[PDB]
């Protein structure tokens, strides 16, 4: 689905950069609004 990793959680632009960090690093601590 869309939320492959943390994606759907709030991804506006962060999908590109911050999701690359959320999936692999820990940038998931930034977003969960959606």
From Swiss-Prot:
Q: How is it used?
A: Neurotoxin that could be considered for development as an insecticide, since ingestion at high doses is toxic to both Drosophila (D.melanogaster) and blowflies (L.caesar). It is not toxic by ingestion for bees, aphids and weevils (S.orizae).
Where is the protein localized? Answer: Secreted; Target cell membrane
- The cysteines joined by S-S bonds are 10-33
Q: What is its main location?
A: secreted
Q: Which keywords are on file for this protein? A: Cytolysis, Disulfide bond, Ion transport, Membrane, Neurotoxin, Secreted, Target cell membrane, Target membrane, Toxin, Transmembrane, Transport
One GO cellular component this record assigns the protein to is: extracellular region
User: Record keywords: Transit peptide included?
Assistant: no
As one GO molecular function, the record gives: toxin activity
Which tissues does the record link to its expression? Answer: Expressed by the venom gland.
Keyword Ion transport found: yes
**Could you tell me the superkingdom of the organism this chain comes from?**
Eukaryota
Q: What else is known?
A: Negative results: does not show effect on the activity of Kv1.1/KCNA1, Kv1.3/KCNA3, Kv1.4/KCNA4, Kv1.5/KCNA5, Shaker IR, Kv4.2/KCND2, Kv7.1/KCNQ1, Kv10.1/KCNH1, Kv11.1/KCNH2, C.elegans KQT-1 potassium channel, and sodium channels DmNav and BgNav.
Recorded family membership: Belongs to the formicidae venom precursor-01 superfamily.
- Report the protein's function: Neurotoxin that causes irreversible rapid flaccid paralysis in blowflies and honeybees upon intrathoracic injection. Causes a quick and irreversible cytolytic effect (at 10 uM) indicating it possibly acts as a pore-forming peptide. Shows only weak effect on aphids (A.pisum) at high doses 24 hours post intrathoracic injection. In vitro, is not cytotoxic on the dipteran S2 Drosophila embryonic cell line.
**What's the protein here called?**
U11-myrmicitoxin-Tb1a
From which source organism is this entry? Answer: Tetramorium bicarinatum (Tramp ant)
């Amino acid at each position: 689905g869309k939320e492959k990793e943390k994606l759907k959680q709030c991804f506006k632009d962060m999908t590109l950069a911050a999701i690359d960090y959320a999936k692999h690093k820990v940038e998931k601590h930034l977003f969960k609004c959606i």
